[model samples]
Target: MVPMDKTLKEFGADVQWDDYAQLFTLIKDGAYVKVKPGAQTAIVNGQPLALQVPVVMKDNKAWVSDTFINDVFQSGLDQTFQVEKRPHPLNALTADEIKQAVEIVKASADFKPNTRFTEISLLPPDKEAVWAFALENKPVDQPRKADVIMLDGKHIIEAVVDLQNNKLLSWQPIKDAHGMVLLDDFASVQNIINNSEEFAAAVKKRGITDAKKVITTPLTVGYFDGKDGLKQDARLLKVISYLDVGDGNYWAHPIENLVAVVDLEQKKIVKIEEGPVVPVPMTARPFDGRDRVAPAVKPMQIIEPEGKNYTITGDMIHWRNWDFHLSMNSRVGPMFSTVTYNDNGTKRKVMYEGSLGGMIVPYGDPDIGWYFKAYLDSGDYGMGTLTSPIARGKDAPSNAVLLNETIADYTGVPMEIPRAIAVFERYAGPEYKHQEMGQPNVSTERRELVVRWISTVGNYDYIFDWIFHENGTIGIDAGATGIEAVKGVKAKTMHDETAKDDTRYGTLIDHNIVGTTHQHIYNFRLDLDVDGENNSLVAMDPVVKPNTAGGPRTSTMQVNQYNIGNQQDAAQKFDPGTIRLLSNPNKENRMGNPVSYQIIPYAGGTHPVAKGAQFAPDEWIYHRLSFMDKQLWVTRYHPGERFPEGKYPNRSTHDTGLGQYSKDNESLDNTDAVVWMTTGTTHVARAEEWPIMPTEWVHTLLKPWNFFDETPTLGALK
Candidate 1:
């Protein structure tokens, strides 16, 4: 065995050591090799390679067999990069590129004291053009570039920079767009907390002294059908303070019933709303902190002698019969592209790309303090920028392997987040089992490979899991967990005189606190390329018909099937009773049926089925966002059309994404189609969810309908 680090360093590749997973990953020229000591297998690209000699650990360092170096270096990365040793310019921004991008922006002639950067990320090159160069086996010119968004007080400046040549490509002002608030904006909000006399007076009105002990969170002012005649870029910073409860968890100690609206550019309080001041919940019993510990349980282990069966070649991952390219976007978090699977020795396309388009958490209450509480997490606050780093033993299993990701910070600088994503395989009970009387049982264990990412948006942490099953099934799950945003109230219980009216809007989860009702609505954009690109949306509706020809039967149930012709006919609420499928009509299975995958949005999970958006038709939110109103939609493929809620969602006046995309009624049948699935739960607080809320999950599934002639995982039965 050779030292893993030494062997990898010999090739001049970048290496990252995961101490908890006891794994090492070497990345060079758009490819990565994942290996672990004492394991009998190594992954090259997405293919698992067998090893004659196992890897081992010695002298506090990992070591691999000689074959590991030959297969992974000579036959693996060397082939793709033998001609070009550097990363392709179309790839994600490099560490040096990020730093240089920041320096280039800072030294530009347009730089000013008031300039604040929001995001600096790679401006991806044309997809078709990039692939054309790769297909032609030609060395493509490096299109190394970055996009920089900066704020100058009330307006935004969008700039494109050529990172390779250290030149500013273009700079343009963003008109009527409420750009993202940067770290400088947060600092400015803090300055208002510390030095603004009027803001201090607002805090003192509630009898809380020492402004330094308060915490403030700035919120984007959502658009509503109202009489406010404010300027387009006018920023509104709604201040909600949390008292320093000294337990390190201040969310429990909210200074409820008091709100301050500040003019962010002026750094002063614009208005203050006064309500009954309630006592803060000071209990640390339910808070997740250092003082909490769970009793020890029986230990279980999952051993993989051949290590992980998945190979990562550059950004693409191959596991079992599945292959997909994964990337972390600054706006959308984790996204998958070019997903495909092997069926009957033939490579079949499943989806071209998939991602969380956008999501909204809208509070149900109509009170002045809560009326404008709807949050468009991705578009407004950049979900990818708020990724929560995962821990090996805590966030995931000890056997799980973690991957690090780098993103541009609000200051246009590179920030490396350790354990930003996790991938693992787990036993999923029995795949198939059969037992005869007095005979040995015949069974096979079900194993699933899951790619997981977590994002903490303010008070809530959301976990997204993309699970790939061996049976040609794909599962998407969203878990909501974190501290509940509770409001302070005067009543402690329902029996109190003030409780009768105080608890009308929400549940009194604790003394002097009410957990407001809300809904977590998520929309996922799935660009499906079934078999090939051309596909059709088909709905199978079950109906009961009279059995005229049958002798005894009075009625029989049958399915009425038809293809949805266009986007307009395709957008509708999901009916659990009906079946919807994205089918490749041009491709046929062995049984002569069209190859298809059924879309099920309301799959069984911990949360209730979100039939549709839980809002009245006349609600103002409908005008701003259109995805939540419908459960399923199919539209023609358009590269620029990604987010469900328009690009500039902050303070937007109308729905510019899904609504606009479907306005033309693009054809859906026998064409490249993208399915947008909306699924989530309406959250009503319970007493047990106080302080820190436990995770509540919602699931969505894409299962094979007639896509396969037989069980895809049957070969693994032996």
Candidate 2:
């Protein structure tokens, strides 16, 4: 006897059933209950009670009676429960506040039991007290702190604890930085390349004699001013190795001319280098296609049966007309925070923290086996520690809703991450259509919500998504799909004669590989608050004019607009028919106009678009990136400006992010701005992207320009 319709949702209530008033209700934070399947009298929030053995209706269930949750929660269901509160200030930090901020930084005096962690988070509250407690519930007295970031071996600290005064507030120390790269530094660089004898005589001269079937790849050694001799602040990585050949895919076997490097505070091996060995492309190629020939493709199930249209509670998230908050970030995984919209009923503000402001890939081969390849995948290794979990209908849409994510790892514990974010609700086809001639066809359809995520890194994967839309639009997309770093070639096809210097900088694709020619790019970081946080950027343009009220007997067009103000004239590049937006001019609408949002960053993509960082301005990646060569940048809002390629990007040398964050020229008209949008591609490998490359995507948008006062789906009257 315990189905009080699933036992009052395991005591945190929320049940609901009626069947012509054979009632049962339940709920829980505004506590209530009602009862009635042959009830013995119970009301509870309106207070009545006395129900000994009645609640019965078995089969179609509402059952109850094993002393009915100890006489309906009076045996103190923990004094009728309550922990709910935190719906804002950018939530994310719990797993018991990440074990109480790692036991208050291990009871601190700059604690260090051979330290490690790299980030604990939360301490980001004062952006005008978290936008005045997310636009006016206001009450935040601050001090909850946390933001840790540890690693005490080659020193990289950056503290701040106060988890409500457990104390340790500012420890600093970053000076020649170099932190991220930890999950046990990829098993300490594969046990310092299996106890190196000069990396086992350079992987047995690239013939690779089973150093446990080799694998390795720890990478990230970028800032080369010692011309790769290492020690810019030493705490390095490099490794590379690959081989696994029994066909489960070893990234298509790439032991190529060895590299090694190591030195995580001397866990050993400082350099190996060796070259001209090549050869290791064994050709097993298994990116889950298991030797090919299969295309059955049938089962399709998405299910909603009238249930989820939105509503995520704790990390907020509503739905139609968006609402946003979500969280995750071990180095950006699904952030979204406080992005509103609802309108016509008013919620407004558009963005105040979007995500992934980091991404680079790089690789246009220079050979020492692609000279310093250039990864920066989330500031040098940590794409949210490769959260790649997704898969229900293969990475989303079996009506998605996956969600897990907890994050910490270099042992500040908190782990979880399963299915790390999915959300769902798709369809998006038509939103309005008309049919005058026949007189009956209105249309409607549309839908969308998405969110998704995925990550992986080391041989790629990425995916991102975000979407949203019910007419206010938001999109983001990203995509990209795995396996194609390739290389080890001496040419096997293109009529091999060392195929024109092994295909110059890349693109041979199979028999004896070459894939290379990289440039993935990315960068997002939005923050815009279109109807309210000042804003500005604008742009517009169009032009052509010269018909002077004669009705285009010669020409017309017109637009022009302006205001780009400062921050190095708002970075630049995405002029795809110019318009741009971000606006807000103190908000307006019903014809007064102003409100704005637009942005775009490549409304299309499949791979060759990229207008940034093809390197060459003395290429040390243009001295630490100006956001992968720009597609718009804006900058101003700063709470230590959230990473665009800076913030201790490992072997650091310069451009501490957004090229020193637009060198302080500030003043973007109204102001509080942020908007960055870069978007990427330039992959160019073809052969249908070798060994597995389907994903592709790219998009970005933000749209809703006049911030809707018209056709916002005209209330979608289908």
Candidate 3:
């Protein structure tokens, strides 16, 4: 027997053994059944006979010993299996407190640099006190109209409050005042903490008694999360949270799952524990070895070992896989401009003609959009059309034949590019995190399709990685590492949770929620058939249409949209009206609204193609290339566009395109960053997917690793 202390520590032996006995009895009973030898009869024609493995006696009871029953039965037995009874974090704040907090929030509201505080006044009709306070505090030096007004529900809300119209108005409590407090409470206390010691002290007192609340009057509360002018307390600076949700489940989401201890007296974040969702991967990882993937060279190129080369040259790439030939056209010009749909017996066509910098398409069907998918051909592991099963590393599929030489430049660049690469496993469900704090439901496990395109001519040549899991999903990844875009500090848009703006290429879309639900993303910048003209980004629908009763709740139809650039500063344009989206017409945006997207490549999966001589290598590439169904859609937002009532609601509010946040820096900036492509497919379940357990959704992803030198020596190349 183990020592009492040790057992207690390791297995909680301190708990009553009766509970264990009960659990053991239940398990034993569930696994056993009595049988009489004489009563058993075997069917002669469809004879029932025991094979190598059979149901036999175990511990004096009939039981199956072929598979380990212990693990299967043990699963879920420890969980309480009860619905969470606690109220969400947003519910913790009261309506009255939220209203009072809003007033406190208005005092610290940051206005445009050129705008005067007198142009904005926090209206408090009930007490009418905030107006008086603003007037008294108004700077006597500069006489100007107030640009912002904080109003209650009773006030007449303005009409045409586009991004520019609402530049002068802010908001406070109404129906869901408490909800707003929960969302922006961190920003509220930052005000008192910065302005007055007395007010700070009062808040600190509440912080002590109120579950040691870590909050602001309205922004974020955690130490690491607090930004703007607010200070994070040193004592509570490193609060982080983890999870032990039972079974082997451990999950974390920082922004959506933050927990902290507050110093209400200081009205500052005293103690904070950020949640588990890591917003960005550590820089020391995959990005550390950029030079290893593709060498520093003016013209990029990937080297391929001396092996058999098969090229399917043409505007359209088509081939047969098993029995399917999902052909695709890579020719330049408009794609969405014309489309053919065939499903549920009826076939329909739609056209989205392009305009200036964008295009306009209507949501023709109310149900959902057609299923789209594209796949890329990253080439083969070796000269043969088929690969041996030994190629099963994170980078190579099991059936891929190994490339003996590493000299072939996978990037196709004139000079040598570095190539140290690593691929991490993909995660799903709660592991994706960020579901809390009322974020959109992004965790629904849906099956979809995608297409893959690879440019093998640049710095890093012929060598590309492929993933083929035990579940029959095959993925081809053409590693694009070491590429760096111009850097800029990220800033909050007008509809952003914060007021400050910064420069950054990717948009983390978790904060923005439109009507659609369930979405997954895969990022890859592929050179379509080595042709830069047709080299564009794509987004695809992952799952196939099941033909089930009501179809799916989330469909990728006209839902593909993104803002690639931003109008960062107010300095460049004199016509503020033009900066606002009001001056622009609806073009490419599927819903004619601003949308957020990420440039970083996450990982994705698909079914492995056939094995053997009959299966052509190009056929497999074309098979995988079917994931690309939709073209990229870039959403643009302009300046002088005052934000509407809710989150990034209008197309003029996206951080990308001509009207985006970084409008001024066009030359070196990627503001012209387009929503290049949409690659995913519609699901059509076959007879094989029945009883769905061992069966799974075949998906794919793209993850970035160190594809260069230890430190990016771009200067060395220059």
Which candidate tops TM-score? 1
Give model 2's TM-score versus the native structure: 0.33
Model 3 agreement with the true structure over 584-662: per-residue lDDT tens digits = 1112223442221122221332422111112133332122221122222232222122111111111111222222322
Each candidate's root-mean-square deviation in Å? 6.2, 26.3, 30.2
lDDT of candidate 2 at residue 158, scale 0 to 100: 81
Give the higher-TM-score candidate: 1 or 3.
1
lDDT against the true structure, each candidate: 0.78, 0.79, 0.22
Local accuracy of candidate 2 as per-residue lDDT tens digits, 229-287: 77776787887878888888788888776777888887888777787887788857776
TM-score rank order: 1, 2, 3
Pick the winner on lDDT between candidates 1 and 3.
1
Over 159-185, each residue of candidate 1 has an lDDT whose tens digit, in order, gives 889977899888888888787656566
For candidate 2, the lDDT comes to 0.79
Worst 10 residues of 1 by lDDT: 77-86
Model 1 clashing residue pairs (backbone): 38-55, 45-311, 46-311
My TM-score estimates for the predictions, one after another, are 0.85, 0.33, 0.20
Q: In candidate 1, how many Å is residue 218 off? A: 1.6
Better of 1 and 2 by lDDT: 2
Q: What's the number of clashes in each of the models?
A: 3, 1, 179
